[PDB]
C-alpha cells in the first residue's frame, strides 16, 4: 500500500473496529467469509445483502483479489471451520455477528427468520443471548442515529 | 476508478453523508478545505486534528492528489470564499460544521475555546444556534455510541 492508502485504510479500520493496525488481506477475507456465512446462516443471502457486505469490505481498501474472490464465494462452509483459519478472526465472534446483523438489515428490517438465524449462528460462535440482544440493540441505535445525522445535515436537498 | 474502487468509495460516501454518487475529487478537496478552515477558525489546528481530517478524507477513496494538496494547504482563507468555489459544497454548511466538530475533538474533548470557534464559523455559515447545539449533541452521541460498540465487540483483547 502507498502511504496515502495506508492513511485512509488505517483511519477507516480504526473507525469501525478500533484496531491500531490494518488487518492482512487474508484476515479481511476470512472475516468477511465468516460474516457472509453468518448472514446466510441456514437460508440465503440476497444480492442486495451481499452487495452491502462487499461494499463494506471494499471501503477498507483491501486488495482487489479479496473482493473478486468474495464475489464468487459460496458461503456454504461451516462457520466454526472458517473462523479457525485465523487466530485473529477467532477473536472476532461479536464483531462478525454485528456485521452479519447489518448485512441482513441491508435489504430491509430484520424479520423473525433473520433474528432466528442470527441466534443459531451466535450459538455456533459461543455468544450468550444477552450479548446477542445487546448487539441487535446496538444495530438499531446505530441505524437510527445515522438516519438522524443524515436528516439533520440534509433536511431537504442533498448535493450528491 | 476501478469498479471495485467505486464499490468501496460509493459505500463509504453513502455511509457517512447519505450520497448516492461519489463526489468529484475537486469537491472532496473544496469540502475538506472548508472543514479545515472551520476547525482552525479563529486560531490553530493541531497535527493530530489535521491527521484525523486527512485520514477521514483519505478513507473516501479520493485521488492521491487531494491528500497531497491538503497536506501543504494553509487553511488561512475566508470560509465563505472556500465554500463558494462549489455549488455542491455551498449546500453542505451543516455537514462541514459537523466534520469540523469531529476534527476539533480528535485531539481531546472540546474546550470552550473550540465551542466558541464553532459558533463563530456557524455564523459565517448562516447556521442557527439551535442547529449548532444539535450538531454538537449529535457528535457527543455518535462518539459515545462508537465507544459502546468497541467495548461490546472487544471488552478485553482485540486482534488488531
Ligand atoms: O478485516 C477486517 C476486520 C474487521 N474485524 C476483524 C477481526 C479480525 C480480523 C479482521 C477483521
Ligand atoms: O467529498 C466529500 C463530501 C462530503 N460532503 C460533501 C458535500 C459537498 C461536496 C462534497 C462532500
Ligand atoms: Cl457498520
Ligand atoms: Zn435481510
Ligand atoms: Zn432494498
Ligand atoms: Zn500526486
Ligand atoms: Zn481539538
Ligand atoms: Zn447553544
Question: Read out DSSP for A111-149?
Answer: PHHHHHHHHHHHHHHT--HHHHHHHHHHHHHHHHHHHHH
Residue A48: give the domain boundaries.
2-155
**Cβ atoms within 10 Å of B89's Cβ, excluding its own:** 25
Resolution in A: 1.9
Domain count, chain B: 1
**Cβ atoms within 10 Å of B14's Cβ, excluding its own:** 18
Per-residue cell: B15: 455511509
Q: Alpha-carbon torsion A59, A62, A63, A67, what sign?
A: negative
* Burial class for A18, CB neighbours closer than 10 Å (0-12, 13-18, 19+): middle
Pairwise CA distance, residues A48 & A29, whole Å? 19
A21-39 in b/e form (b: 16+ CB < 10 A) is ebbebebbbbbbbbbbbbb
**Pair A63, A25: CB distance under 8 Å:** yes
Residue A160 domain-assigned?
A: no
**Pair A123, B127: CB distance under 8 Å:** no
**Pair B19, B13: CB distance under 8 Å:** yes
Sequence-ordered list of residues with C-beta below 8 angstroms from that of A99, at least 6 positions apart, any chain = A35, A38, A53, A56
Pairwise CA distance, residues B148 & A18, whole Å? 11
A110-125 in b/e form (b: 16+ CB < 10 A) is eeeebeebbbebbebb
**Cβ atoms within 10 Å of A101's Cβ, excluding its own:** 25
* Burial class for A59, CB neighbours closer than 10 Å (0-12, 13-18, 19+): buried
Residue A40 domain-assigned?
A: yes
- Cβ of B58 within 8 Å of Cβ of A141? The answer is no
Q: How far does residue A142's CA lie from ligand 3's centre (Å)?
A: 8
- As a whole number of Å, the end-to-end CA separation of chain A is 29
Q: Which residue out of B60, B92, B93, B100 has the highest number of ligand 2 atoms within 8 Å of its CB and is therefore the one to mutate?
A: B92
Residue B160 domain-assigned?
A: no
- Cβ of B94 within 8 Å of Cβ of A142? The answer is no
Residue B47 domain-assigned?
A: yes
Quote the DSSP letter at residue A43: S
CATH of the domain at A95: 1.10.3680.10
Sequence-ordered list of residues with C-beta below 8 angstroms from that of B58, at least 6 positions apart, any chain = A4, A5, A7, A8, A11, B67
Strand extents, DSSP E, B1-75: none
Residue A110 domain-assigned?
A: yes
Per-residue cell: A51: 452487495
Amino acid at each position: 500500500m502507498s502511504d496515502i492508502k495506508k492513511l485512509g485504510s488505517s483511519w477507516i479500520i480504526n473507525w469501525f473496529f478500533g484496531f491500531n493496525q490494518i488487518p492482512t488481506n487474508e484476515d479481511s477475507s476470512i472475516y468477511m467469509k465468516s460474516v457472509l456465512t453468518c448472514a446466510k446462516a441456514d437460508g440465503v443471502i440476497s444480492p442486495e445483502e451481499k452487495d452491502w457486505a462487499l461494499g463494506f469490505c471494499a471501503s477498507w481498501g483491501v486488495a482487489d483479489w479479496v473482493i473478486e474472490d468474495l464475489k464468487t464465494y459460496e458461503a456454504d462452509e461451516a462457520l466454526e471451520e472458517v473462523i479457525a483459519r485465523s487466530p485473529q478472526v477467532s477473536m472476532a465472534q461479536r464483531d462478525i455477528l454485528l456485521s452479519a446483523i447489518w448485512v441482513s438489515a441491508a435489504d430491509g428490517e430484520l424479520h423473525e427468520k433473520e433474528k432466528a438465524k442470527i441466534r443459531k449462528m451466535a450459538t455456533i460462535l459461543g455468544i450468550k443471548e444477552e450479548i446477542v440482544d445487546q448487539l441487535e440493540q446496538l444495530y438499531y441505535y446505530e441505524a437510527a442515529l445515522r438516519q438522524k445525522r443524515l436528516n439533520l445535515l440534509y433536511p431537504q436537498k442533498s448535493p450528491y
